[PDB]
DNA sequence: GGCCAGTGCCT
DNA sequence: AGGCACTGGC
């Protein structure tokens, strides 16, 4: 269902996805990150075809994140071809997210 | 006798204006105040006691009021003023030989909020007493619009100052008495506030003399300085700052950065419940559109680069490598000293390789800090005259040992230590070009041979009747030890003894260690004899919570098990204190003048050794020999049962003289 | 800054 | 054992 990126996988997986990938930097120690967790999971199914959801832990992949000035988590980026389309840090509701997305998707 | 004190415009090293001087002559019972104009008179007054062959009492005057007057005398009046040691008393010196067990703030150069134990009465009442004058002045002017300036409370003389002056002396005379009152160091039958210097000195416990002469000499050494090679060290600082820069890079590569939670205010609360789960990293719930957040918690984190200096990072990264921390600290953390680091064994090859680079990176730092970047770094402490005047406390130990500081020149890495060849080479006579001839001086390093093992010999002769004494000299000592304790190698015995972690030192870790002490303190009943005789004179649950030192002084003792070392460290301590005193003295009773402008100069004294500076190789060799007699003297003088000795060495710097 | 913790340098 | 003091972390 949901994509599980890696430092080495990130490029050819999100960057050249051509489609829209909402990358989610996270860590098993952040409460909020564990919160938005299931949200994004269902977001993935209720958006199959139009949106691709890819999670990337920053404890396991410390190289990637430090490039988007990540200063918080779950920092969310909606990738739309090479560059960041939109950024949002926090646990947006199962409805708040569907609003932050659509208004961009 | 008289009890004076003076207020100048600055510390010795920068003082240039006498502000006032109070005095309380004991034969008059008066307090004659001298003002800035009276300076010359002040000098006359003191110079008067010396004529009577009287005694002048100062509080820390040995290291200041006294040499600061010699300075100011030439300066302000083009006068040659020189109070002779013999007529000077120093309540600080004394208060350090009587209150040996407490602790001082060093006259207000350290915060007592971090200093343990109990603070004295006048001590805290003469040291902090300086700040009482600051605020008293600051206030009286911090209200009159005039903004307090850095330290303008001392730029110019005034009445407030003239007052705090006069009070200084009273507290001083007050102290002076509470000290002379001590029947252990001063016999009640005499009243020293009424004797001449020659009577004060002889008619009192020997420590009082040995301490003052020392306090006076080392104060001379301090003022001398230690020619320090700024260049050679600035040179090293670049070589290290560099080797650092690499090891860092080479590492930061092997150990990437990472994120850590930092900055969360509130506490993550269960989605349903609402419990303030602590274990979980604090978050920040704020607002919310190019909005950054929503009202939707989030843990604020920081990006942190591996830091070889951080013993934490070293534990982190190395643990994720598969290291299983054995030794931890009574604070819930793993011991990461070089010891364990040496032992750590992970699987990733590149990584275990980097353990040896941290070990070295940590050390490179112990050097860059001690020499260049630290607060008491050499490079920060070098004087304009190209010498480092580290301070020396001729006591402050408890056994008699001095304490060095600012910077501490008794912890320069030795030559048997990474870069301990370049550091030592930067402290040397050879770095001082003569005043006239303009030619480099020569250094003379003299040190006491086996002073330790010997203090034991002597003390355990009242049992061995010359055994170890003779062994240590007319034969061999260590093999007897090596045989004493059932041990394998001699060098092992050299450690076993000079260190009494024992069992370990031989192989095992407990039983064999706590078995050797048995066979050793069994085939050598003399050390066993000593040990017993002491417990007998202290234990009964105390009788005398102290011990008597070679000169007479009381030498407090922390614990029954420390009893013997105490007794031993002290003996060798005083032995040297007295030694460097005689040495210089003798060098004078021969014809040489102490000082840079003279023939020789004391540069350093690290327990059982001294680094004298000589103007000519000739003089240099005499000192080396003068140092000999002196020691031998100290021997007969204290009826030592084991001939003591010294070994000389001549050279350009501390590095080649050891 | 002021302050402990964990360490390492000398004899 | 007796001291001083550097760096990291709060
Ligand atoms: N662990 C130690 N702690 C303190 N001082 C020590 C320690 N080990 C040795 N020493 C002292 C003893 C005298 C000094 C130099 O030792 P060194 O081994 O050169 O002389 P030594 O008298 O033991 O033997 P020798 O002169 O025959 O070689 O260092
Ligand atoms: Mg004073």
Coordinates of C-alpha atoms in Angstrom, one line a residue, chain B residues 72-505:
Chain B
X72 CA 55.9 51.1 44.1
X73 CA 58.8 52.5 46.1
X74 CA 61.1 52.7 43.1
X75 CA 58.2 53.8 40.9
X76 CA 56.6 56.6 42.9
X77 CA 59.6 57.8 44.8
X78 CA 62.6 56.5 43.0
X79 CA 63.4 54.8 46.3
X80 CA 65.1 51.5 47.0
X81 CA 62.8 49.8 49.6
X82 CA 63.4 46.2 50.7
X83 CA 61.9 44.5 53.7
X84 CA 64.0 41.5 54.6
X85 CA 62.3 38.1 55.0
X86 CA 63.4 37.7 58.7
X87 CA 61.2 40.6 59.9
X88 CA 58.0 39.6 58.0
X89 CA 55.1 37.6 59.2
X90 CA 52.2 36.6 57.0
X91 CA 48.8 35.7 58.5
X92 CA 47.8 33.9 55.3
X93 CA 50.9 31.7 55.4
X94 CA 50.2 31.0 59.0
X95 CA 46.5 30.6 58.6
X96 CA 47.3 27.9 56.0
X97 CA 49.6 26.1 58.5
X98 CA 47.0 26.1 61.3
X99 CA 43.6 25.7 59.5
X100 CA 45.1 22.9 57.3
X101 CA 41.8 21.0 57.2
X102 CA 39.3 23.6 56.0
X103 CA 39.4 25.6 52.7
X104 CA 39.9 29.2 51.5
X105 CA 38.5 31.1 48.5
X106 CA 42.1 32.2 47.7
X107 CA 41.3 35.9 48.6
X108 CA 38.3 36.1 46.4
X109 CA 39.5 34.5 43.2
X110 CA 37.1 31.5 43.4
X111 CA 33.4 31.0 44.3
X112 CA 32.8 29.2 47.6
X113 CA 29.4 28.0 46.3
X114 CA 31.3 25.2 44.6
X115 CA 33.9 24.7 47.3
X116 CA 33.1 22.0 49.9
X117 CA 33.5 22.0 53.6
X118 CA 33.2 24.9 56.1
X119 CA 34.6 28.3 55.3
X120 CA 36.7 30.1 58.0
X121 CA 35.7 33.2 59.9
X122 CA 38.1 36.0 59.0
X123 CA 39.0 34.1 55.9
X124 CA 35.6 34.7 54.4
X125 CA 35.8 38.0 56.3
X126 CA 38.9 39.3 54.5
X127 CA 38.5 37.7 51.1
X128 CA 34.9 38.6 50.4
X129 CA 35.7 41.7 52.4
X130 CA 36.9 43.2 49.1
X131 CA 33.5 43.1 47.4
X132 CA 32.0 44.8 50.5
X133 CA 34.0 47.9 49.3
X134 CA 32.9 47.4 45.7
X135 CA 29.2 47.7 46.3
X136 CA 29.7 50.2 49.1
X137 CA 31.4 52.4 46.3
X138 CA 29.3 51.2 43.4
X139 CA 26.1 52.0 45.3
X140 CA 27.3 55.4 46.6
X141 CA 27.8 56.3 43.0
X142 CA 25.4 53.9 41.1
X143 CA 22.7 56.3 42.3
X144 CA 24.4 59.6 41.4
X145 CA 23.9 59.0 37.7
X146 CA 27.6 58.0 37.4
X147 CA 27.4 54.5 35.8
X148 CA 29.8 52.1 37.5
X149 CA 32.8 51.6 35.2
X150 CA 34.4 48.1 35.0
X151 CA 36.5 48.3 38.1
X152 CA 36.9 52.0 38.8
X153 CA 36.5 51.3 42.5
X154 CA 40.3 51.2 42.6
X155 CA 41.4 53.8 40.1
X156 CA 41.6 56.5 42.8
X157 CA 42.1 56.8 46.5
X158 CA 39.4 58.1 48.8
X159 CA 38.0 58.0 52.3
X160 CA 35.8 54.9 51.9
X161 CA 38.9 53.1 50.8
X162 CA 40.9 54.7 53.6
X163 CA 38.4 53.2 56.0
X164 CA 38.1 49.7 54.6
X165 CA 41.9 50.0 54.8
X166 CA 42.0 50.5 58.6
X167 CA 39.4 47.8 59.1
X168 CA 41.6 45.4 57.2
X169 CA 44.3 45.7 59.8
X170 CA 42.0 45.1 62.7
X171 CA 40.7 41.9 61.3
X172 CA 44.3 41.1 60.5
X173 CA 45.6 41.8 64.1
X174 CA 42.5 39.8 65.1
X175 CA 43.5 36.8 63.0
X176 CA 47.2 37.1 63.9
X177 CA 46.3 36.6 67.6
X178 CA 43.8 33.7 67.1
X179 CA 46.8 32.0 65.5
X180 CA 49.6 32.9 67.9
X181 CA 47.2 31.6 70.6
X182 CA 47.6 28.1 69.2
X183 CA 49.6 26.4 71.9
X184 CA 50.8 23.7 69.5
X185 CA 52.8 26.1 67.3
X186 CA 53.3 28.9 69.8
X187 CA 54.3 28.3 73.5
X188 CA 52.1 30.2 76.0
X189 CA 55.1 31.1 78.1
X190 CA 56.1 33.7 75.4
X191 CA 54.2 36.6 74.0
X192 CA 55.2 37.0 70.3
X193 CA 53.3 40.2 70.0
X194 CA 56.2 41.4 72.1
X195 CA 59.4 39.6 70.8
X196 CA 62.0 40.4 68.2
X197 CA 62.1 38.6 64.9
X198 CA 65.0 36.3 66.0
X199 CA 63.0 35.3 69.1
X200 CA 59.7 34.9 67.3
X201 CA 61.4 32.5 64.8
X202 CA 63.5 30.3 67.0
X203 CA 61.2 30.4 70.1
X204 CA 58.4 28.9 68.0
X205 CA 57.5 25.6 66.3
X206 CA 59.8 24.9 63.3
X207 CA 57.0 24.9 60.8
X208 CA 56.4 28.6 61.3
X209 CA 59.9 29.2 60.0
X210 CA 60.0 26.6 57.3
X211 CA 56.7 27.8 55.9
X212 CA 57.5 31.5 55.8
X213 CA 60.9 31.0 54.2
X214 CA 59.1 28.9 51.6
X215 CA 56.2 31.3 51.2
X216 CA 58.8 34.0 50.7
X217 CA 61.0 32.0 48.2
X218 CA 58.2 30.6 45.9
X219 CA 56.8 34.1 45.9
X220 CA 60.1 35.0 44.3
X221 CA 59.9 32.1 41.9
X222 CA 56.5 33.2 40.8
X223 CA 57.8 36.7 40.1
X224 CA 60.8 35.2 38.2
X225 CA 58.7 33.4 35.7
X226 CA 59.4 30.5 33.4
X227 CA 60.7 31.4 30.0
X228 CA 58.0 30.1 27.7
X229 CA 58.5 29.7 24.0
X230 CA 55.3 31.4 22.7
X231 CA 56.5 30.5 19.1
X232 CA 57.2 26.8 19.6
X233 CA 53.7 26.5 21.1
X234 CA 51.9 28.7 18.7
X235 CA 53.6 26.4 16.3
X236 CA 52.2 23.3 18.0
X237 CA 48.8 24.8 18.2
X238 CA 48.6 24.9 14.5
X239 CA 49.9 21.4 14.0
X240 CA 47.2 20.1 16.4
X241 CA 44.3 22.4 15.3
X242 CA 45.1 20.7 12.0
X243 CA 45.5 17.1 13.0
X244 CA 42.2 17.8 14.7
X245 CA 40.4 19.2 11.7
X246 CA 41.2 15.9 9.8
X247 CA 40.3 13.3 12.5
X248 CA 37.1 15.3 12.7
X249 CA 36.3 15.1 9.0
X250 CA 37.6 11.6 8.7
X251 CA 35.1 10.8 11.5
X252 CA 32.1 12.9 10.7
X253 CA 32.1 10.8 7.5
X254 CA 32.2 7.4 9.3
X255 CA 29.5 8.6 11.7
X256 CA 26.8 10.7 10.1
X257 CA 24.7 13.2 11.8
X258 CA 21.2 12.4 13.2
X259 CA 18.1 14.0 14.8
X260 CA 17.3 14.4 18.5
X261 CA 14.2 15.8 20.0
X262 CA 14.8 19.2 21.5
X263 CA 12.5 22.1 22.3
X264 CA 9.1 20.5 23.1
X265 CA 7.1 22.5 25.7
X266 CA 3.9 20.5 26.4
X267 CA 3.8 16.7 26.9
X268 CA 2.4 14.2 24.4
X269 CA -1.1 13.3 25.6
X270 CA -2.7 10.0 24.6
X271 CA -5.1 10.4 21.6
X272 CA -8.0 9.2 23.8
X273 CA -6.9 9.2 27.5
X274 CA -4.8 12.4 28.0
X275 CA -2.1 11.1 30.2
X276 CA 1.1 13.2 30.2
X277 CA 3.3 10.3 28.9
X278 CA 6.9 11.5 30.0
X279 CA 9.0 8.9 28.2
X280 CA 7.8 10.4 25.0
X281 CA 9.7 13.5 23.7
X282 CA 8.1 16.8 24.5
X283 CA 6.1 18.4 21.6
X284 CA 4.7 21.8 20.7
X285 CA 1.0 22.2 20.0
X286 CA 0.2 25.6 18.6
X287 CA -2.8 29.0 14.2
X288 CA -3.7 27.0 11.1
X289 CA -2.8 28.9 3.7
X290 CA 0.9 28.4 3.4
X291 CA 0.5 27.7 7.1
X292 CA 3.4 25.8 8.7
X293 CA 1.2 24.2 11.4
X294 CA -2.4 23.3 12.4
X295 CA -4.5 23.2 15.5
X296 CA -2.0 19.0 15.5
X297 CA 1.1 18.4 17.8
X298 CA 4.6 17.9 16.5
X299 CA 8.0 17.1 18.1
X300 CA 10.6 19.9 17.4
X301 CA 14.0 18.4 16.7
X302 CA 17.6 19.4 16.1
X303 CA 20.1 18.2 13.6
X304 CA 23.2 17.1 15.4
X305 CA 26.7 16.4 13.9
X306 CA 28.8 13.7 15.5
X307 CA 31.2 15.2 18.0
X308 CA 34.3 13.2 18.9
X309 CA 34.6 15.2 22.1
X310 CA 31.1 14.2 23.2
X311 CA 31.4 11.1 25.3
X312 CA 27.7 10.7 24.7
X313 CA 27.9 10.5 20.9
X314 CA 30.9 8.1 21.3
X315 CA 28.6 5.9 23.4
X316 CA 25.6 6.3 21.1
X317 CA 27.2 5.5 17.7
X318 CA 29.5 2.9 19.2
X319 CA 26.6 1.2 20.8
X320 CA 24.6 1.0 17.6
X321 CA 27.7 -0.8 16.3
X322 CA 26.9 -3.7 18.7
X323 CA 29.0 -2.7 21.7
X324 CA 27.8 -4.1 24.9
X325 CA 28.7 -1.6 27.7
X326 CA 30.1 -3.4 30.7
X327 CA 31.3 -0.7 33.2
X328 CA 28.6 2.0 33.8
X329 CA 28.5 5.0 36.2
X330 CA 26.5 5.5 39.4
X331 CA 24.4 7.9 37.4
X332 CA 23.1 5.5 34.7
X333 CA 25.8 5.9 32.0
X334 CA 28.6 3.7 30.4
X335 CA 32.2 4.5 31.2
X336 CA 33.9 5.7 28.0
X337 CA 37.4 6.5 29.1
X338 CA 40.3 5.5 26.8
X339 CA 40.5 2.3 28.9
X340 CA 37.1 0.9 27.8
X341 CA 37.5 2.5 24.3
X342 CA 40.7 0.4 23.9
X343 CA 38.6 -2.6 24.7
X344 CA 35.5 -2.0 22.7
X345 CA 35.1 -4.4 19.8
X346 CA 32.5 -3.9 17.1
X347 CA 32.0 -5.7 13.8
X348 CA 32.0 -3.1 11.1
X349 CA 35.8 -2.8 10.2
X350 CA 35.8 0.9 9.2
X351 CA 34.1 1.7 12.5
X352 CA 36.4 -0.1 15.0
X353 CA 39.1 1.7 13.0
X354 CA 37.5 5.0 14.0
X355 CA 37.6 4.0 17.7
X356 CA 41.4 4.5 17.5
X357 CA 40.8 7.8 15.9
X358 CA 38.5 9.0 18.7
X359 CA 41.0 7.9 21.3
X360 CA 43.5 10.1 19.5
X361 CA 41.0 12.8 18.8
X362 CA 40.1 13.1 22.5
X363 CA 43.9 13.4 23.3
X364 CA 44.6 16.0 20.6
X365 CA 42.0 18.0 22.5
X366 CA 43.5 17.5 26.0
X367 CA 46.5 19.2 24.4
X368 CA 44.9 21.9 22.4
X369 CA 43.0 22.9 25.5
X370 CA 46.0 22.8 28.0
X371 CA 48.1 24.9 25.6
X372 CA 46.0 27.1 23.4
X373 CA 42.2 27.2 23.8
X374 CA 41.5 26.5 27.5
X375 CA 40.9 29.3 30.0
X376 CA 44.1 28.7 31.8
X377 CA 45.9 27.9 28.5
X378 CA 49.7 28.7 28.3
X379 CA 49.2 30.9 25.3
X380 CA 46.7 33.0 27.3
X381 CA 49.0 33.2 30.3
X382 CA 52.3 34.2 28.7
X383 CA 53.5 37.6 30.1
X384 CA 54.9 40.5 28.1
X385 CA 58.3 39.6 29.4
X386 CA 57.9 36.2 27.7
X387 CA 57.5 34.1 30.9
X388 CA 54.6 32.3 32.4
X389 CA 54.0 33.2 36.0
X390 CA 51.9 30.3 37.2
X391 CA 50.9 30.8 40.8
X392 CA 52.0 28.5 43.6
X393 CA 50.4 27.8 47.0
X394 CA 53.2 26.6 49.2
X395 CA 50.6 24.6 51.2
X396 CA 46.9 24.2 50.4
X397 CA 47.5 20.4 50.1
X398 CA 47.3 19.1 53.7
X399 CA 50.4 17.1 53.8
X400 CA 52.7 20.0 53.0
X401 CA 52.7 19.6 49.2
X402 CA 52.1 22.8 47.4
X403 CA 49.2 23.3 44.8
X404 CA 50.0 24.8 41.5
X405 CA 47.6 26.9 39.4
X406 CA 46.9 29.6 36.8
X407 CA 48.0 27.9 34.8
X408 CA 49.0 24.8 36.6
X409 CA 52.6 24.1 35.8
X410 CA 52.7 20.8 37.6
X411 CA 50.6 19.0 35.0
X412 CA 52.5 19.7 31.8
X413 CA 52.4 16.4 29.9
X414 CA 55.7 14.6 30.5
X415 CA 58.0 13.6 27.7
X416 CA 56.6 10.1 27.8
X417 CA 53.3 11.4 26.4
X418 CA 52.1 12.4 23.0
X419 CA 53.5 15.8 22.3
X420 CA 54.9 15.8 25.8
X421 CA 58.2 16.4 24.1
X422 CA 57.2 19.7 22.5
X423 CA 55.4 21.1 25.5
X424 CA 58.3 20.5 27.9
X425 CA 60.7 21.9 25.4
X426 CA 58.8 25.2 25.5
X427 CA 59.5 25.8 29.1
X428 CA 63.2 26.5 29.5
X429 CA 66.1 28.7 30.6
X430 CA 67.1 28.7 26.9
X431 CA 64.1 30.9 26.2
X432 CA 65.5 33.8 28.2
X433 CA 68.2 35.9 26.5
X434 CA 70.4 37.5 29.1
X435 CA 70.0 41.1 30.1
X436 CA 73.5 42.2 29.1
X437 CA 75.3 39.5 27.2
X438 CA 72.0 39.0 25.4
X439 CA 72.9 35.3 25.4
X440 CA 70.6 32.3 26.3
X441 CA 70.6 31.0 29.9
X442 CA 71.0 27.4 30.9
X443 CA 68.6 25.3 32.9
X444 CA 69.4 23.0 35.8
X445 CA 66.9 20.3 36.7
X446 CA 67.5 18.8 40.1
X447 CA 65.3 16.1 41.6
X448 CA 65.1 14.0 44.7
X449 CA 66.0 10.3 44.1
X450 CA 63.5 7.8 45.5
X451 CA 62.4 10.2 48.2
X452 CA 59.2 8.1 48.5
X453 CA 60.6 4.6 49.2
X454 CA 63.1 6.3 51.4
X455 CA 60.6 8.0 53.7
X456 CA 59.4 4.5 54.3
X457 CA 62.8 3.1 54.9
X458 CA 63.6 5.7 57.5
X459 CA 60.2 5.4 59.3
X460 CA 60.4 1.6 59.3
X461 CA 63.9 1.5 60.6
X462 CA 62.7 1.8 64.2
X463 CA 61.8 -1.8 63.3
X464 CA 64.1 -2.9 60.5
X465 CA 67.1 -1.2 62.1
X466 CA 68.6 -0.2 58.8
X467 CA 67.2 -3.0 56.6
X468 CA 65.4 -1.3 53.7
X469 CA 67.5 1.8 54.5
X470 CA 70.7 -0.1 53.5
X471 CA 69.0 -2.2 50.9
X472 CA 67.7 1.0 49.2
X473 CA 71.2 2.4 49.1
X474 CA 74.2 -0.1 49.5
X475 CA 72.5 -2.8 47.4
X476 CA 69.1 -3.2 45.7
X477 CA 65.5 -2.6 46.9
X478 CA 63.1 -3.7 44.3
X479 CA 64.2 -7.3 43.9
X480 CA 63.8 -7.6 47.7
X481 CA 60.2 -6.4 47.1
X482 CA 59.8 -8.6 44.0
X483 CA 60.8 -11.4 46.4
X484 CA 59.0 -9.9 49.3
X485 CA 55.6 -10.3 47.5
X486 CA 55.5 -13.5 45.6
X487 CA 55.8 -11.8 42.2
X488 CA 57.2 -12.7 38.7
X489 CA 58.9 -9.7 37.2
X490 CA 60.9 -6.9 38.9
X491 CA 59.2 -4.1 37.0
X492 CA 56.0 -5.5 38.3
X493 CA 57.3 -5.1 41.9
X494 CA 58.3 -1.5 41.0
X495 CA 54.6 -0.9 40.3
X496 CA 53.3 -3.0 43.2
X497 CA 55.2 -0.9 45.7
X498 CA 55.1 2.7 44.4
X499 CA 51.4 2.0 44.3
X500 CA 50.4 1.3 47.8
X501 CA 43.7 -2.4 41.1
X502 CA 46.5 -4.5 42.6
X503 CA 45.5 -8.0 41.5
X504 CA 44.8 -6.6 38.0
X505 CA 48.3 -5.1 37.9

